[PDB]
Amino acid sequence: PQITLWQRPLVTIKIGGQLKEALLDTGADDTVLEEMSLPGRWKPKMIGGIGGFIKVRQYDQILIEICGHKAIGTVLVGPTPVNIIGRNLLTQIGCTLNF
């Protein structure tokens, strides 16, 4: 669909069978989700943004559904104030910025 930016581009995502609200963030290299449990091994990682760095846990090969579209990729879990769907997954659903 076509999402306007008058409001934050929040969409519903399905991950781990859980429905969550996440932000489609073209400014995010990675996908960062709030603290949650994911299966498998993870690697510690520091990701920076506005305000500095936060420590997150990196999970690879994670399946996420974004507006019906399935996508696979790395997901970072940590104390982020909002769920962020970064470019690593936006590319997988054919998301493009247009004007």
Place this chain on the structure above:
Amino acid sequence: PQITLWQRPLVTIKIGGQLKEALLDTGADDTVLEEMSLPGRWKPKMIGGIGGFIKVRQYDQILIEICGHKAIGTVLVGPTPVNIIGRNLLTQIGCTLNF
């Protein structure tokens, strides 16, 4: 144009007569630019990012060209890693997310 997200959506912007690279950031409510000189008085503003909050200087009615599209709006200047073009300006250039 149509921008894919396999790489950061960096574009050249023109502000204060200078060229700078900035990120088309749908995850940003506001436009935040790296430390620079702008005219007029500024007002304080606290903005939150993934790593916490930062104090920024808010300048209003600032002329900024984004990929040839002239925009005039609020710009925040502060300790940001990269120049961020947020929704306040993305909407002025008719930018939308599509997939």
